[PDB]
Structure formats: C-alpha cells, structure tokens
C-alpha cells in the first residue's frame, strides 16, 4: 500500500465519532465543543495549567491572545482538531487512572 504525510491533521473519523466518544471524555470536552474543534471553531485553550485559561478550556481568540500577552507562550489555543491532538497527547493515565 501507499501512504500520505497529511500535513493538515486527520484524526480517525471513527475515533470519537461514536456516542461513547473516548476522546470526548479523555479531553472531557463537550460533544458540541468537540464538533467545533473539528470544525476549527473552538479555539479552545490547548494546554497549560499556569495560564489563566484552563489547559482544557474553550478559549476565545481575544481571550487566548490576552492570556498570551499575560503569560508569554503559556496561552495555547487551537481551533482545529490539533487542539484535540494535544488534549489526548496530554490526557494522562500514568497513575492518574488509580486516582480516578
């Protein structure tokens, strides 16, 4: 089989489309919020607990820029599904599962 690099990311359409969306819980994002993130509309705060916007929080572009001005690069907010890519790249089960 061939391949493709796919610079514009493509999370598995099967992944999280199901009603028991595992990603929608690991990121804990709302289903409509997840739809906006895929639709590149959420602009959700990508990560970082230090910044005022929560590591997993829908961040307004104005709010994201304001938090960036406040704390350097601590404000990260992606509208596209790369937000979810981080939100799962950051969603941790390392001894967190025992706490849960």
């Amino acid at each position: 089989m061939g391949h493709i690099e796919l610079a514009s990311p493509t999370a598995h359409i099967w992944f999280l489309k199901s009603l028991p969306s595992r990603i929608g819980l690991l990121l804990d994002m709302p289903l409509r919020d997840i739809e906006r993130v895929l639709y590149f509309e959420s602009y959700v705060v990508i990560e970082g607990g230090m910044t005022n916007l929560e590591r997993q929080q829908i961040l307004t572009e104005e709010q994201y820029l304001d938090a960036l001005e406040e704390f350097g690069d601590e404000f990260d907010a992606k509208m596209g599904a790369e937000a979810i890519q981080a939100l799962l790249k950051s969603m941790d089960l390392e001894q967190e599962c025992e706490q849960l």
């Binding site: 089989m1 493509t10 598995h12 099967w14």
Partner: protein, 49 residues
C-alpha cells in the same frame, strides 16, 4: 479449492494431474485484503504469531 485460491489453484490442478489429492491452506487473500482495509481506514493492521 472452490474459492479464490490462485497459487493453491495451480498446485491443486497440478496435483490432480499427478493424482496427489492434496490442498494447501496457507492463508486467504481476502484475509490480507481485509487487513489492508483496516490499514486503509484509520487503524493499523498487525497480526501476532
């Protein structure tokens, strides 16, 4: 025999010519095809031993 076997079809035809009466299972091509279809969609296809 009555399925998609190609290399098994040739072996079986040769055996029937020779009167050997043996079929070689191997693995169906449709199996690897479905594996690819899995790899074609967003999931790797990997079979353990």
């Amino acid at each position: 025999v009555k399925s998609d076997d190609v290399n098994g079809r040739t072996k079986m035809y040769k055996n029937i010519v020779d009167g050997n009466h043996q079929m070689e299972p191997g693995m169906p091509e449709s199996f690897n095809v479905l594996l690819k279809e899995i790899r074609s969609l967003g999931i790797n296809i990997e079979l353990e031993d």
